[PDB]
Amino acid sequence: GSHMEDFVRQCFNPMIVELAEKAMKEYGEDPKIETNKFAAICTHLEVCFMYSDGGSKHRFEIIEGRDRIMAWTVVNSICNTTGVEKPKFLPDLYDYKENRFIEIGVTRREVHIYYLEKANKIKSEKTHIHIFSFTGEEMATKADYTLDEESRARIKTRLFTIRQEMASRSLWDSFRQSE
Ligand SMILES: C[C@@H](N1CN([C@H]2c3ccccc3CSc3ccccc32)n2ccc(=O)c(O)c2C1=O)C(F)(F)F
Ligand SMILES: [Mg+2]
Numbered sequence: 772g773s774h775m776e777d778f779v780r781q782c783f784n785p786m787i788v789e790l791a792e793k794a795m796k797e798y799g800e801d802p803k804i805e806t807n808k809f810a811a812i813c814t815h816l817e818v819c820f821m822y823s824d825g826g827s828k829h830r831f832e833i834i835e836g837r838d839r840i841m842a843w844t845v846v847n848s849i850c851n852t853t854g855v856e857k858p859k860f861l862p863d864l865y866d867y868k869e870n871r872f873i874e875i876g877v878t879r880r881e882v883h884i885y886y887l888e889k890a891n892k893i894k895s896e897k898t899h900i901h902i903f904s905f906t907g908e909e910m911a912t913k914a915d916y917t918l919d920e921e922s923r924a925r926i927k928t929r930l931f932t933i934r935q936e937m938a939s940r941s942l943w944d945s946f947r948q949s950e
């Protein structure tokens with residue numbers, strides 16, 4: 772039983788903890804052992820949820836936090852009714868306003884390097900990429916950051932609070948050196 776597993780359960784809300792547990796178990800991993808990944812998946816989930824809450828009412832369809840099959844089911848319905856091309860890989864959101872899938876990224880390295888890796892992996896020009904760092908920087912496709920500045924600032928505040936809360940527990944260095 773790790774110090775980091777208890778921190779995650781105290782830091783994130785129960786709905787997010789459970790979806791993250793279900794995400795890892797779906798791919799045969801265990802949150803009690805891969806505790807840094809546990810924390811990262813929770814962090815990514817919370818960012819996705821704040822992001823979809825950042826726009827107007829019906830703006831975003833949330834793809835993240837679903838089982839593999841339902842996630843691809845919703846992608847197929849979105850494509851077969853928008854005409855947008857079907858992404859090679861599962862994204863995190865769909866933007867009904869801008870009519871594009873979004874891939875959210877949270878990294879403990881430089882947004883530049885992480886953004887390059889995901890762009891090269893995606894190859895799909897269509898899917899919009901939006902990277903957030905734990906230091907308060909971001910990088911989005913075509914310099915288009917989708918949400919207004921206040922909603923993005925709130926995300927960056929939360930990320931920095933997570934970072935200090937791990938620091939106060941000496942979990943931060945180990946978390947940084949895992950990615
Ligand atoms: C399963 C889906 N994944 C993989 N993987 C994901 C994940 C989920 C469960 C078990 C292992 C892992 C690898 S580690 C990690 C770390 C933080 C957040 C998410 C994740 N991703 C990393 C960064 C993302 O931005 C992202 O969207 C995903 C994601 O969605 C997929 F696309 F492959 F179908
Ligand atoms: Mg995802």
Ligand SMILES: [Mg+2]
Pocket residue numbers: 815862863874875876
């Ligand atoms: Mg993502």
